[PDB]
Design a protein around this ligand. Structure first.
Ligand SMILES: NC(=O)c1ccc[n+]([C@@H]2O[C@H](COP(=O)([O-])OP(=O)(O)OC[C@H]3O[C@@H](n4cnc5c(N)ncnc54)[C@H](OP(=O)(O)O)[C@@H]3O)[C@@H](O)[C@H]2O)c1
Ligand SMILES: Nc1nc(=O)c2c([nH]1)NC[C@H](CCc1ccc(C(=O)N[C@@H](CCC(=O)O)C(=O)O)cc1)C2
Length: 159
């Protein structure tokens, strides 16, 4: 099953860590927790943004160009990326934007973190149809000493 995982600010704006105005370690534990022991697919820009493979995960980079790093698996199409995952129960898509767009139509679940924050940004999570997805989990949290802003984890499943 393919799942997408992302953190959204006001308006579906998503962005790179450094581009993030917020500081939410709880959001990171959540991402860690939901992606550990699974393959994660991401695009070039996001790869470079992270700069090191993520541990305890098979890291697949969807890129149109040859790869310049032997620590990860490089693929060139969506179908290749999915075949590179092998037979597993859940594949995790970690963005970026384009990547999110291409996999949504095949995804069966979405793990989203809604952050109580307005930020001007270049990109957005694809617009998905609410009638087609069921919110089966949700949990809001106020900000705090570690967490800079309020946020809400939600998990939806395609109906
Ligand atoms: C910032 O934000 C924008 C880029 O961020 P983003 O969120 O779009 O980053 P991203 O999703 O993390 O990266 C997308 C990139 O990964 C590769 N990719 C995506 N779909 C692919 C496919 N079907 N086959 C092969 N490679 C594929 C391409 O890299 P390649 O360049 O290696 O093709 C593509 O440009 C910019 O324009 C910039 O100014
Ligand atoms: N929930 C969620 N939050 C986010 O900020 C993002 C998504 N999803 N998905 C897409 C994207 C990926 C960004 C991103 C950047 C760095 C690390 C990282 O260091 N992960 C470590 C966490 C370190 C720790 O937990 O102490 C990991 O091993 O997962 C993870 C994700 C950003």
């Amino acid at each position: 099953m393919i799942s997408l995982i992302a953190a959204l600010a006001v308006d579906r704006v998503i962005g790179m860590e450094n581009a993030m105005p917020w500081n939410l370690p709880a959001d990171l534990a959540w991402f860690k927790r939901n992606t550990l022991d699974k393959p994660v697919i991401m695009g070039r820009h996001t790869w470079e943004s992270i700069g090191r493979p993520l541990p305890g995960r098979k890291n697949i980079i969807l890129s149109s160009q040859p790869g310049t790093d032997d620590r990860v698996t490089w693929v060139k199409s969506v179908d290749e990326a999915i075949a590179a995952c092998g037979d597993v129960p859940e594949i995790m898509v970690i963005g970026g934007g384009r990547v999110y767009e291409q996999f949504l139509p095949k995804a069966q679940k979405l793990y989203l973190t809604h952050i109580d924050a307005e930020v001007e940004g270049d990109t957005h999570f694809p617009d998905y149809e609410p009638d087609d997805w069921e919110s089966v989990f949700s949990e809001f949290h106020d900000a705090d000493a570690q967490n800079s802003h309020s946020y809400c984890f939600e998990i939806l499943e395609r109906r």
